[PDB]
DNA sequence: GTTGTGGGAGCTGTCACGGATGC
DNA sequence: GCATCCGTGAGTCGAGG
RNA sequence: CUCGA
């Protein structure tokens, strides 16, 4: 009973027992609505009219109003910007990806210049730059790569009070801090890293009367600030006055926030100096401890210390606002030169275009999108990756805290996160607690505060009027729970109800005391987390791991929706934006492996091009396939084609495998996994991986490289797959080592070997003298050449300086599941494949059906994730189908929930939502009435177990084993990517040690702790060898190779080059270091074989 | 109360029950896990500690 | 050769410790 | 006579771009 | 920068 809203969406029967009173909002709205505010689109106009005041202003309109008008110091001239308009887009998205461009639109504005003494008003339309644009999917394209702007967590402007304890006698010491929208701050009156500031030396009070302060008049407090914060200059009477007037009263310097001003006026008074008086009164009357406070003109404020992690005092700046702030920076940097040109030039001859240099705004936008920590390479292993990435909230970055100045209380789950930031989905590693994901139903508001929806309660009556509350508004109310008994008409059945109050604590209050109720369970969860069946049965560690590992599934050649899922797979796949969706209801007029054309009813034609075998940012294969047939009538929103990890419109991150839970000969020891070789023969876990090799011919000192099929002394047979250009041919199968693009690089004459010198002399060779710098395929890689793209400087192809030609070979490979690959269930139950057994010796059921995967029993109980077991049971139920016996009534176990679950055909699609859905009793009931197989044999008994035969000896295993169907994902951690060895390779020019990294054919690092270990063994010679002739001895290593090749003993080791380099660095530090003999001076460091 | 439910659990469980066999034999895991799985997790810590 | 008006970005949610310095 | 202010520590090994 | 043990 789910997915009824989405047309054509398959029928996934749901065990849920609660009505869904609110659908999932646009799971990308967090990004879109933000950008649509920034731009001022009609969408945002209507959305603000529906839930906002009558005077809306977009991000750019606001920036312009703030900047206007650029005025001369004498007030003689004034420049005013207005009416931000966009042209159409320069190039489409796929075009920008192909050409390595930046999807953007030209920005235009009306610039009105006025000379106050000539009356001349020359209006003009000025162009501000190529403003980068947000795509349908909510991303950006910069330099041809797709990027996401992750929302940032930061402290909203305002004043905040806290209560510390002094090291004197544990006295309760109050402190305050004022965080501004822009400018400096202060504390208590210490200001700008200058302590020892009496609060009374700058202007019933308990200690305000005690201030100690010795002065009278206004010049003392005016001169003390210039003598205490503006040093390096004598004490003056005018400069201190000027600075004090330009500190906080001045609006140019000190930017009073809008959100900040709202928060502060809510903290002190409905309607600056008033604020400072209220703040002093607040600190005083907080040192006392009184409940409320009365300020002149303001009233009704609770005297209380503020929580720094509360979501009513912690906001997030969406993409729109980050862009707005970068634009403000560029605009101020431009206004500087605008005034600086107003000064010099003559009036009546300066047009808006003459004094407006946009270079700083362009550079600001560019630097933001290209260097900000919040513009991130889009995680697109699969649709769920990108969907969560867009909805993500991180606290690091410019303007937030530091990855090292962020302690542990920052990373703690605050009670105000309920329904706003999911508490499960967060990284396990260093970034833990710092990167969360937006809750499913959550929604950002104009001020950057995360609101969440609740059903209104009128006289213990759950209504259908929904209301969105922020953390503050919520705290001030009593929120019922979603799984609260309610009779029709919205009436709590129980005398009282469980609820949450402001203290972050729960209570059991009479029904007439409830204000709002949760819209649904799982309201606190994120999208990924909401997709773990039987979540409540899993510990938070393994559940966090399950979410994180769902975001790592690799798309498989053929995708299969989970036999048992939540209700979120469909909506997740759709919002993610990797499936094609019918924008307008019509009739399929044509369908091909290439495109899909629908004829709308009003005669309109719309066509959709299928992404076919597209490489993703992480090598996964984005490949769409249509799921409509010619003549099919499709409604608006219906899914037209499946994406990479989707099936009929549902997130299909893995496959349904026949699992047996039992230790099998140790091959699944200590988390290993055993797979049936079927999964290889039938490609059940096979995936496609597309890599992009690139190579350019550029200008060198000795000339210019040339991409040529003619490479020095290469066998005609080796080039057999190269075209005339020296580029491999499409569809060619390339093993590791083959050539991909031939290239020669001008070589100097001094480098020619003596052999080559004589060869070019005797045979009268030419003066080419090049080196083979051709692009070869790296180790552990192979595949068919999917594609070839090429860019020539000859043609009108734009490339960097000195780069003549540039070719890119796109190579695909089909990876079969293999030993070493990493699989995992949705319950944080990960493991590498220990062995892939022949189907014949796999344990099999009575009917010869061999299991597909053997999961070691010893791994389940201690991890506290029996969720996988419940899933196995329900999955077998769904794979066999069932029929609850209704004759003589409906059994009590199936009475509560089951409505259309009383029977189900084999391979039925069922969803068990989190915190609702399948109950243990109902699971057991279904397990009792399993349907039989072909021969009318019930294979899995009422415990969920079944006898199995040892496919090796033939004898049956003595005890029944739990067999079932489990959803297993192929996580993007594959041996093919991680195997790496090296005998000898490139070294670093600085340390002369082996390069690091597989991509560079590097060597393993023998770290300090490894040398400790080696010493503990007493393996002196092994440690020396590892550290001298394998790393740094520039002659020792070549000697070692020469000795191995000629069957001679390994020579004695020399001197690590890194030591010479250390000596050189010391010397450069003016330290005279010197190596000495037993009794001698400093030792110094620094043909016949060739002639032979 | 947590210790009492753990005791009742250990009593009710037959000693050949696999979840008991795996813990008692010393193979892997403690009985606190058996108690939080069936029975009750008990008290959970605070953000403070 | 420079001749009318003129203070910038940055922390900025870490902690626990030991010993010059500086009033 | 010492109280602050500063300057030093704060796990290892791996992968992309 | 993100991620793996």
From Swiss-Prot, chain A:
Its EC number is 2.7.7.6. InterPro entries: DNA-dir_RNA_pol_bsu_ext_1_sf, DNA-dir_RNA_pol_bsu_external_1, DNA-dir_RNA_pol_su2, DNA-dir_RNAP_su2_dom, DNA-dir_RNAP_su2_hyb_sf, RNA_pol_bsu_bac, RNA_pol_bsu_CS, RNA_pol_bsu_protrusion. Changing residue 123 to A: Does not affect association with TRCF, but weakens interaction with CarD. It catalyses: RNA(n) + a ribonucleoside 5'-triphosphate = RNA(n+1) + diphosphate. GO terms for biological process: DNA-templated transcription; response to antibiotic. Belongs to the RNA polymerase beta chain family. The RNAP catalytic core consists of 2 alpha, 1 beta, 1 beta' and 1 omega subunit. When a sigma factor is associated with the core the holoenzyme is formed, which can initiate transcription. Interacts with CarD, TRCF (Mfd) and RbpA. This is DNA-directed RNA polymerase subunit beta. The gene is rpoB.
Curated annotation (Swiss-Prot), chain B:
Signal peptide: none annotated. Induction: 6-fold repressed by starvation. The RNAP catalytic core consists of 2 alpha, 1 beta, 1 beta' and 1 omega subunit. When a sigma factor is associated with the core the holoenzyme is formed, which can initiate transcription. DNA-dependent RNA polymerase catalyzes the transcription of DNA into RNA using the four ribonucleoside triphosphates as substrates. Belongs to the RNA polymerase beta' chain family. This is DNA-directed RNA polymerase subunit beta'. It comes from Mycobacterium tuberculosis (strain ATCC 25618 / H37Rv).
